[PDB]
Amino acid sequence: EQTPLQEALNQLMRQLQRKDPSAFFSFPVTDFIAPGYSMIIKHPMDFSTMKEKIKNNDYQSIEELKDNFKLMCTNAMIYNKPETIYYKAAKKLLHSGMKILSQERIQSLKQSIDFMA
């Protein structure tokens, strides 16, 4: 059903989502919630969109998921001002996920994914 790469991506996604208990990043931000969001943020991203990309096999590396995760956090730091709870939640999530998506974990997974070919 799923490739070893897809399974690794999902395990990383579950660790990243454990760092968003308030659930701000679960689903796309709507303009109803955040007026003008669609005019400000050119490339929206959220965890549910990322989980669909994993399911549809749109990622060919962990690094592409890592780029989408960084994009998701920095979008929140562009739309929301530094003093806001969403900016500070994004900054904390980005820092936590950069260790969850560590280059060391990526290297380890690359080997075990390669050996499962």
Ligand X SMILES: CCOC(=O)Nc1cc(-c2ccc(C)c(NS(C)(=O)=O)c2)nn2c(C)nnc12
Residues lying near ligand X in the complex (CB under 6 A): 23-27, 29, 33-35, 76, 79-80, 86
Compute the distance between CA of residue 87 and CA of residue 74 in angstroms, rounded to an integer. 9
Give min distance, CB of 114 to ligand X, in A. Answer: 34
Residue 32 half-sphere exposure, CB side, CA atoms within 13 Å? 1
Give min distance, CB of 52 to ligand X, in A. Answer: 14
Closer CB to ligand X, residue 36 or residue 104? Answer: 36
Q: After what residue numbers is the chain broken, C–N > 2.5 angstroms? A: none
Closer CB to ligand X, residue 9 or residue 29? Answer: 29
Give min distance, CB of 116 to ligand X, in A. Answer: 33
Phi, psi of 81 (to 5 degrees): -75, 155
Closer CB to ligand X, residue 29 or residue 109? Answer: 29
Give min distance, CB of 110 to ligand X, in A. Answer: 30
Compute the distance between CA of residue 80 and CA of residue 90 in angstroms, rounded to an integer. 10
